[PDB]
């Protein structure tokens, strides 16, 4: 159960992992002349951006409740990817994602990781409300789930993780392409996806065409004084493309 990974300039491994299911079996690819909408020959940064980038350390505990991100927004700051995104009205990209989560032989607990589509998050508050841009687009900073006092609550998404933050049951979440970090089974987990939309390419900053969720399905523990472990995620964009070049987006 060993893998190595190589994209654009950068490489990844686990020597205790079971291979990704490729999302729907479709290995990532560029747009087709048969399906395209945009007229130009689009921007292929290739190796300089279909390469890995990784998020700030989250860390977790038995008390922890969940984390997620929305893409491409979660990668808006990833140099070439980030600006090439911000300077175009449109683009498209798939992703290779690996989540890094080693423990000792002496830990238990499990996370589910789900790649998830439009994942249209429900409000925290009841009634005539909807989610505000700052929170739907948390950037690489992401959304960890917490017990208390998130301001502007009327525009906040719900914290209700076991309702998938949208009023659907968890545990059926395995309907999406998914994996488990299980500390016995593996030390890491991986998933890869092509581009997807109802449209052949999309307004990157305006719509998170993919999203990624990680949930503490089983509580972290060990008897060791190292009561907590970080998690980090690395992503490479795939076949990344951009079209309608103009100024940098604000």
């Amino acid at each position: 159960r060993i893998i190595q990974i190589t994209r654009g300039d950068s490489t990844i491994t686990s020597q205790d992992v079971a291979n990704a299911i490729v999302a729907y079996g479709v290995w990532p690819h560029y747009l087709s002349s048969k399906d395209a909408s945009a007229i130009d020959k689009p921007s292929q940064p290739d190796t300089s951006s279909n390469r890995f980038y990784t998020l700030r350390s989250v860390t977790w505990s038995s008390s922890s409740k969940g984390w997620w991100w929305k893409l491409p927004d979660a990668l808006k700051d990833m140099g070439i990817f980030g600006e090439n995104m911000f300077y175009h009205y449109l683009g498209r990209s798939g992703y290779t994602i690996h989540v890094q989560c080693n423990a000792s032989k002496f830990h238990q607990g499990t996370l589910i990781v789900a790649l998830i589509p439009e994942h249209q998050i429900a409000s925290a508050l009841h009634g005539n409300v909807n989610v505000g841009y700052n929170y739907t687009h948390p950037g690489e900073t992401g959304r960890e789930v917490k017990a208390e006092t998130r301001l502007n609550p009327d525009l906040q998404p719900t914290e209700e993780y076991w309702l998938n933050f949208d009023g659907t049951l968890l545990g059926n979440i395995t309907i999406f392409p998914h994996q488990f970090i299980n500390l016995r089974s593996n030390n890491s987990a991986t998933i890869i996806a092509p581009y997807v939309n109802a449209v052949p390419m999309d307004s990157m900053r305006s719509h998170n065409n993919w999203s990624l969720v990680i949930i503490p399905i089983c509580p972290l523990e060990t008897s060791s004084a190292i009561n907590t472990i970080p998690i980090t995620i690395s992503i490479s964009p795939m076949c990344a493309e951009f079209s309608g070049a103009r100024a940098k987006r604000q």
Binding site: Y53, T54, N102, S104, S224, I229
Partner: protein, 177 residues
């Protein structure tokens, strides 16, 4: 550490939840400390060098212990990095510390000129830099510590010119007999 084995080694702290810097070095073949390596001395016997360098690293800690680490290189004209994400923008490797002992990786040759001068005066080749990609995790009651040893050699790419009587060593007076 100098008067001992320990200057070949670094100590890691499994106690720390941080992303931060473990160590950094130059990359100029006849700079300190690299000059003191045998490739260093051979380069110090020379004026021109070219081609990429191999670097290698063993997780010398307790077999029961796990981590993944960032080894990275800085293309110069710029300061030595001060966040892990800075080094992540540089060319770098993240070490899957599997059953296998060692990660090995290369500073790519990115000299403007086909050669570079072996010793810089007021000049630079770039940096090696090292960071906690995860925290280091020992299992409970393991030693609260780990060791790392670091290696270098010429790649198949490597070569030198202008053999010169080396910087590295001095004779004062007569050699007695």
């Amino acid at each position: 550490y100098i008067n001992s084995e320990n200057m070949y080694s670094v100590v890691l702290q499994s106690s720390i939840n941080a992303p931060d810097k473990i160590f950094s070095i130059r990359t100029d073949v006849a700079s300190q400390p690299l000059a003191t390596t045998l490739i260093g001395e051979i380069s110090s016997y020379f004026t021109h060098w070219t081609g990429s360098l191999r670097f290698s690293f063993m997780f010398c800690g307790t077999a029961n212990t796990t981590v993944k680490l960032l080894l990275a290189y800085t293309p110069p004209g710029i300061a030595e990095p001060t966040t892990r994400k800075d080094a992540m923008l540089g060319t770098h490797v993240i070490w899957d510390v599997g059953l296998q002992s060692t990660i090995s990786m290369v500073v790519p040759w990115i000299s403007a000129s086909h050669y570079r001068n072996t010793s810089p005066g007021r000049s630079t080749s770039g940096y090696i830099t090292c960071w906690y990609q995860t925290r280091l995790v020992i299992p409970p009651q393991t030693p609260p510590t780990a060791r790392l040893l670091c290696f270098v050699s010429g790649c198949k790419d490597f070569c030198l010119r202008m053999a010169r009587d080396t910087n590295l060593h001095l004779q004062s007076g007569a050699i007695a007999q």
